[PDB]
Amino acid sequence: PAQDNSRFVIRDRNWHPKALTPDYKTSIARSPRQALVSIPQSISETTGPNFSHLGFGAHDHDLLLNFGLPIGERIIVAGRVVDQYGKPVPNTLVEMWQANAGGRYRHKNDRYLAPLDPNFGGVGRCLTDSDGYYSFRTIKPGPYPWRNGPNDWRPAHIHFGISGPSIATKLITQLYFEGDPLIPMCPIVKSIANPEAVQQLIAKLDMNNANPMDCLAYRFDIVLRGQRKTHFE
Amino acid sequence: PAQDNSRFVIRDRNWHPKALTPDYKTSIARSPRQALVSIPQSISETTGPNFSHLGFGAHDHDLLLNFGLPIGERIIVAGRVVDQYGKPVPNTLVEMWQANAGGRYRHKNDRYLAPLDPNFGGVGRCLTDSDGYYSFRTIKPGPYPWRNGPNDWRPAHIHFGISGPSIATKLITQLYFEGDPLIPMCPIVKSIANPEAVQQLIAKLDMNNANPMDCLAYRFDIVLRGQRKTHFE
Amino acid sequence: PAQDNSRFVIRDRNWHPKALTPDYKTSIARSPRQALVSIPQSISETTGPNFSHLGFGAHDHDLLLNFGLPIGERIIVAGRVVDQYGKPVPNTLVEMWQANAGGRYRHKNDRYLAPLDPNFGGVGRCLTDSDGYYSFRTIKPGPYPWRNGPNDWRPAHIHFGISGPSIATKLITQLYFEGDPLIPMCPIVKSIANPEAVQQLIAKLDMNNANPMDCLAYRFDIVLRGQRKTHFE
Amino acid sequence: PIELLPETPSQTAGPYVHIGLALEAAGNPTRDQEIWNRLAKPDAPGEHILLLGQVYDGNGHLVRDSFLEVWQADANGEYQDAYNLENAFNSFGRTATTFDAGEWTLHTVKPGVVNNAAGVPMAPHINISLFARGINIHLHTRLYFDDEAQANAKCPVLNLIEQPQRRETLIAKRCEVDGKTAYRFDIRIQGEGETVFFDF
Amino acid sequence: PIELLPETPSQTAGPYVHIGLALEAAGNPTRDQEIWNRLAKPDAPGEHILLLGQVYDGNGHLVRDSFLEVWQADANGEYQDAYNLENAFNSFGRTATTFDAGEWTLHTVKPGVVNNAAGVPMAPHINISLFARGINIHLHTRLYFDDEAQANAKCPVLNLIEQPQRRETLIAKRCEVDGKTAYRFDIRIQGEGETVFFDF
Amino acid sequence: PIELLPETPSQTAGPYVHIGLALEAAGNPTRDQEIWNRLAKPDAPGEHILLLGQVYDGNGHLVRDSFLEVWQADANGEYQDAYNLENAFNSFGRTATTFDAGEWTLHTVKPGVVNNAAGVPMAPHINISLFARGINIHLHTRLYFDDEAQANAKCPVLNLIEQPQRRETLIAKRCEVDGKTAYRFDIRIQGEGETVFFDF
Amino acid sequence: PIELLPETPSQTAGPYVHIGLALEAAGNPTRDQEIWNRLAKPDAPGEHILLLGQVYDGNGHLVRDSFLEVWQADANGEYQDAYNLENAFNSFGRTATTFDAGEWTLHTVKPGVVNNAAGVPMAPHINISLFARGINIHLHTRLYFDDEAQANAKCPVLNLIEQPQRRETLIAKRCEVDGKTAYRFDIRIQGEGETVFFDF
Ligand SMILES: O=C(O)c1cccc(O)c1
Ligand SMILES: O=C(O)c1cccc(O)c1
Ligand SMILES: O=C(O)c1cccc(O)c1
Ligand SMILES: O=C(O)c1cccc(O)c1
Ligand SMILES: O=C(O)c1cccc(O)c1
Ligand SMILES: O=C(O)c1cccc(O)c1
Ligand SMILES: O=C(O)c1cccc(O)c1
Ligand SMILES: [Fe+3]
Ligand SMILES: [Fe+3]
Ligand SMILES: [Fe+3]
Ligand SMILES: [Fe+3]
């Protein structure tokens, strides 16, 4: 069973988006009005599931094949998972979901007029390697309109979920594409107060990783909370 | 009795910290939601107590003897009390309290593990002289952790209370020490939106005032609301 | 026995303080007037003691327990010892000494009026690990007056002694604390001509390494002479 | 425009205010002379009364570390600014809420009427300043008496409050404590029944 | 001060979180192995229980697109980190609220007691993480049981919550579902009876 | 040119160096294991000798707060780097001067011959490092023996000192203390008879 | 830190200091009232003595253009600040060295004992300030007497001088001049037997 041997650097709640960000309408009623209660880390918080023995399918991470070929821009999304100390996070669970080339999600509630793609599902998962590397093969998602302001459009994005070594490190986020003119207009993106933090969410075109005459590549590294041994406790 | 002859410059409520400052968790539930009701100044507001006849002990302002010798950095905290017009505020009451060298307060509810100092109490009072000068002799207090965020630490500080000429001028504040790296990270400090206002709370090392081979000195001036005569009222 | 396999990068005597620094009065009569004689490195200079078998006590590095609890600011002083090539120096001896919270040393010759702390000795030692890491637990020392100019005060500091791999790398220095206003006025500090060299002596506040609700931490890294193998000798 | 020196910024009193301003309350040895909660000596002219109340936060929870300062006129509606323990009546006082019960109490006399700047008389009242951890800048309020409806009705200050409902939050409720005239004044910092706080 | 690399900033899970992390719930074909709401198989040691609840917004309206993650010790107060569908018990699970009823359910066992860093025992509990559209950064809570009042009174975690009334927000109410021991745990994100959320 | 990381700058040991490195001398309780002035147990091979000396400033006044470190080969001309209190012989030692007499002492054996990088034998010597208040960066010297003239005349190190008269400053003078072989080695930091200090 | 206005920087007196501060010495006509080397009138209480000396540069050469200022207590150990030619005793004086013989003289009384700030008595002394071309900022010293050995031994000032050999530089040598009690005080600015100079 797991053991309490680690401490995780405290989260900077001024770095991460706040709970109440009124331009993002839904946050109004879904944000707490009372202050969060701080508690010391115990084994409850410093441990988490290990997915090494989960039975991954052969194309769990290849969205081009896991659902004919999907229509859209063929891309590889790769990067590494490291902690705040710059240490790789091996055998960690990386999950992702997204819309198709038109901005359509394969979900009951998605009524957007852009058509579904009969060869695309939009879900992948990958366990990072010994060096903290992950990769997926998919198609570039399209932006889509949503009921916020009368003319709001989400920039093209991929949703990501990362496990890390504990429940203290677990994170849900979104990757944006370098140069997307929609980024600075987004109320969700704007939930993040510091511009420098926004930069962390933008995948960079990575020509070095592309497959000539086949597909482009984007690089997206993720930083989880720094893990340290306990001392003089 | 007292008479209504003065008027006091209206307070700048954008200069002082606001009531609701979310990072300072306790302010959440302890800040009014309705606007303050402004009212004209009357004798009720423009008068206040005078402590010229209070019977002060001879060591009232000497924390080194008023409680052996306390352990810690021997310092002198001196300065002047003026109004916004630059006029000295003579015979006014200055009160201060602080933790010991380890950041431990001599109070029931302070369960911080740094120990108490048998020769230290942590309270002083001084009446300004005819030039608005006051002085204390103490030990520099230590920073201390508090239950705000998971790792919040108060910068070293001395609590101050100044009467002034009326209840309109009475003030409670904190003095911080020049160069303390904790200053900029404190959420109580940050309740003050203007960086310029923060600066005003920082005591400056004063070598000129030090007793060689004995103790250092810190200069801390206080500015109370400007006092003026009524006119064309 | 030891073997002559290494060469150490020549010291930069313009980086380190010179011998004669008149503001530091004692340096006057204790600095050579003849130039140092340069000599080639031999086994005599390229070897030194290895303290791996020294029998360290379990609290050799904990000043809180090695002498009740001391009064003062609880801090952890940690860092790494690397060489100029950035290579870790494992299993090396790090020794430290310092005053108590009030700037008083537990030494016969110290007649400063700040009292001794019945639970504090002020001496520690630690052998670096595999990665060149060391760590001490102590209380933040206070500044103290000394008979140099008529009103001279040493900034708060910890004296450090480092062995390294040979008598060639052995070094004695002082650690200073980030933001201390006394730093720039100390004649000992000023013995160092290059401001950039001074910066290396300043321990930075390290919140990441602090124990919430218990103590703060400071990071101090040490760089010893670069070690290289001999070539074409 | 013209700008004066900026006033020193306020900071919360914090949780340990007691050690500096309410030694008895903090459970520490007091000095010879201390400023406390008994404004009037038994032989001071005027109707002697007992004041008591609690302080609530926005959640309806008791604030057990609040510190209050009061300023009032004597029976003759005069402000005695020369503070002395020897005096029979002092216009200034200090009180704090019990870390247990969380209630404050004061011993004084019902203050006489004073006029505003315009020469219009104000209903008898006690000026209060509230301090505590969580309060960045102290809160100013006034205590009024329920048995002074007539006067209260004409108050030039009380009449500045737009909504009549808000005015009632400033009126203390007459009661008796051990057959002694008492008045209960509860302060609600935030939410339902939030007390009026002033700026001047 | 020392600055490390900043952590990647959080972002809301959004309304389609199910496609990615709750396949069955989104009504899409699932893969061979999925992380779902069954932490224990019939032959797992301990007392088998059913957990269910609803999630409310600040308006008292049901949040029908919420996603929840759970982490708990096995009946021996042990944390089973090696996740495997072959296991009789998994310490980790996932659940979500119905687009219709908007109620989540979990099948597990009552967690054994675990000690805090200082060696002090915490009352039986389940660690919860709440995700959904409108929530920028996930909310952390703990589920305690009403039938553990004695343990609950001595919990060093429960005890850090200043106001006793708020502690109640964390206690699940024991019931029965098809003669099966059940506990109801409702979450109120905002307002009256707002659930306590932690930072660690 | 290529620049490496700069070495951490030296600082004076200060007046209280004894507290950290010469515990006994500071007149403070020692630890179980201390590094001191006895390099050789009485049963170690070689010619057992006693070393003693004084340290003078530029005014010819005794330096009573100096700290010294020594490094030498064993009688077989070998450096024993693994330091252990169990060893009969240790290559490394520590000494300091009396706050009173201001004289240091060391109990060792006469070092055997070592060769330089070129393969040329150096005369028997002890490597010394001098620390003290007023000394910003420690001073390096060597102790040679007066009864080794032959070897001394051919030392490649000693031969690097231009002036013959200066070489004389590194030669310890043989004596006898209580019918024990001793060598006196005085250090003159500055002025007339100033000791040769090295850079390497 | 706090910074005051910087003090006006000192400059050497220059070779012509006499024209301004020692008119007679410069060989120029003097004014009605001059500040000179006769502190005590024959009718002044105390032991009447003559002080004399020479000033030497670092080469052992006489400084024939020096200017000296003296401050001392009267025989009761009292400082007489109210300067008047009418006074039988003035605490202040001025002298200078002959362009010829290069010797200064002073006519005064032996000063009485004065206590330091801590209430400890200092041995009888005369405070001296030396000015001259080549001296950028004047030198402060003190003259003590060889016949106050008992007192000298206990002076907290003299005791601040680390090295006893240096304390002797401050001791005037008692002699007789034309059957009068004289003390000789030579000042060596630099080198062999360099006189202690103070900073305060
Ligand atoms: O912006 C916030 O974080 C906040 C927190 C609590 C109440 C409130 O009105 C606002
Ligand atoms: O932020 C404020 O100052 C404030 C004042 C009143 C209501 C409110 O929601 C916020
Ligand atoms: O400043 C120096 O390094 C120095 C070195 C030798 C003689 C001297 O006067 C000065
Ligand atoms: O407001 C607080 O909670 C607080 C806690 C510690 C020190 C202080 O000044 C204030
Ligand atoms: O929070 C939402 O309403 C939303 C809508 C669309 C995409 C997304 O990530 C979030
Ligand atoms: O060299 C000194 O005189 C001195 C005095 C105090 C501390 C220190 O490191 C050095
Ligand atoms: O010091 C000098 O030699 C000198 C010479 C001329 C003018 C003066 O101020 C000084
Ligand atoms: Fe405080
Ligand atoms: Fe989306
Ligand atoms: Fe020191
Ligand atoms: Fe001139």
mmCIF file of N, CA and C in Angstrom, chain G residues 141-167:
data_model
loop_
_atom_site.group_PDB
_atom_site.id
_atom_site.type_symbol
_atom_site.label_atom_id
_atom_site.label_comp_id
_atom_site.label_asym_id
_atom_site.label_seq_id
_atom_site.Cartn_x
_atom_site.Cartn_y
_atom_site.Cartn_z
ATOM 1 N N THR G 141 44.469 62.590 19.374
ATOM 2 C CA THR G 141 45.272 61.824 20.358
ATOM 3 C C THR G 141 45.007 62.334 21.766
ATOM 4 N N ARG G 142 45.676 61.763 22.744
ATOM 5 C CA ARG G 142 45.545 62.127 24.162
ATOM 6 C C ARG G 142 46.924 62.067 24.831
ATOM 7 N N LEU G 143 47.159 63.043 25.697
ATOM 8 C CA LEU G 143 48.433 63.082 26.465
ATOM 9 C C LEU G 143 48.105 62.646 27.922
ATOM 10 N N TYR G 144 48.869 61.668 28.369
ATOM 11 C CA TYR G 144 48.769 61.137 29.750
ATOM 12 C C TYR G 144 50.129 61.461 30.403
ATOM 13 N N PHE G 145 50.191 61.313 31.707
ATOM 14 C CA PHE G 145 51.387 61.611 32.507
ATOM 15 C C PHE G 145 52.027 60.357 33.088
ATOM 16 N N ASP G 146 53.355 60.353 33.093
ATOM 17 C CA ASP G 146 54.163 59.259 33.564
ATOM 18 C C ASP G 146 54.105 59.073 35.084
ATOM 19 N N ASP G 147 53.721 60.087 35.807
ATOM 20 C CA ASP G 147 53.578 60.093 37.238
ATOM 21 C C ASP G 147 52.164 59.801 37.742
ATOM 22 N N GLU G 148 51.328 59.225 36.924
ATOM 23 C CA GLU G 148 49.949 58.864 37.216
ATOM 24 C C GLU G 148 49.743 57.395 36.813
ATOM 25 N N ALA G 149 50.817 56.676 37.003
ATOM 26 C CA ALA G 149 50.970 55.264 36.714
ATOM 27 C C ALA G 149 49.808 54.469 37.292
ATOM 28 N N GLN G 150 49.447 54.772 38.522
ATOM 29 C CA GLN G 150 48.349 54.052 39.192
ATOM 30 C C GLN G 150 47.042 54.222 38.463
ATOM 31 N N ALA G 151 46.761 55.445 38.085
ATOM 32 C CA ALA G 151 45.546 55.845 37.345
ATOM 33 C C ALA G 151 45.584 55.337 35.893
ATOM 34 N N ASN G 152 46.729 55.512 35.290
ATOM 35 C CA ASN G 152 46.951 55.120 33.893
ATOM 36 C C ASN G 152 46.565 53.658 33.696
ATOM 37 N N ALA G 153 46.982 52.847 34.657
ATOM 38 C CA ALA G 153 46.723 51.414 34.634
ATOM 39 C C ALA G 153 45.250 51.079 34.534
ATOM 40 N N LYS G 154 44.403 51.932 35.073
ATOM 41 C CA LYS G 154 42.972 51.771 35.115
ATOM 42 C C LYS G 154 42.137 52.582 34.175
ATOM 43 N N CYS G 155 42.726 53.370 33.320
ATOM 44 C CA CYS G 155 41.930 54.177 32.347
ATOM 45 C C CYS G 155 41.207 53.266 31.354
ATOM 46 N N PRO G 156 39.902 53.441 31.262
ATOM 47 C CA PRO G 156 39.079 52.667 30.324
ATOM 48 C C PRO G 156 39.463 53.061 28.898
ATOM 49 N N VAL G 157 40.003 54.278 28.740
ATOM 50 C CA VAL G 157 40.388 54.715 27.379
ATOM 51 C C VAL G 157 41.645 54.025 26.913
ATOM 52 N N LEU G 158 42.675 54.122 27.701
ATOM 53 C CA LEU G 158 43.993 53.530 27.513
ATOM 54 C C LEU G 158 43.929 51.999 27.412
ATOM 55 N N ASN G 159 42.988 51.428 28.125
ATOM 56 C CA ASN G 159 42.698 50.021 28.187
ATOM 57 C C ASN G 159 42.040 49.510 26.924
ATOM 58 N N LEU G 160 41.554 50.398 26.069
ATOM 59 C CA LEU G 160 40.914 50.054 24.791
ATOM 60 C C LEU G 160 42.011 49.747 23.755
ATOM 61 N N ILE G 161 43.202 50.237 24.015
ATOM 62 C CA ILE G 161 44.339 49.984 23.093
ATOM 63 C C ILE G 161 44.786 48.519 23.329
ATOM 64 N N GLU G 162 44.496 47.694 22.349
ATOM 65 C CA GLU G 162 44.782 46.280 22.334
ATOM 66 C C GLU G 162 46.165 45.921 22.861
ATOM 67 N N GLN G 163 47.205 46.508 22.293
ATOM 68 C CA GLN G 163 48.595 46.260 22.638
ATOM 69 C C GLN G 163 49.206 47.229 23.597
ATOM 70 N N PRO G 164 49.596 46.717 24.751
ATOM 71 C CA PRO G 164 50.211 47.521 25.810
ATOM 72 C C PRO G 164 51.379 48.336 25.309
ATOM 73 N N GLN G 165 52.156 47.801 24.387
ATOM 74 C CA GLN G 165 53.335 48.530 23.859
ATOM 75 C C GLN G 165 52.910 49.862 23.216
ATOM 76 N N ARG G 166 51.694 49.893 22.683
ATOM 77 C CA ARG G 166 51.136 51.068 22.020
ATOM 78 C C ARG G 166 50.632 52.113 23.017
ATOM 79 N N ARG G 167 50.262 51.667 24.203
ATOM 80 C CA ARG G 167 49.756 52.543 25.255
ATOM 81 C C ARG G 167 50.814 53.525 25.722
#
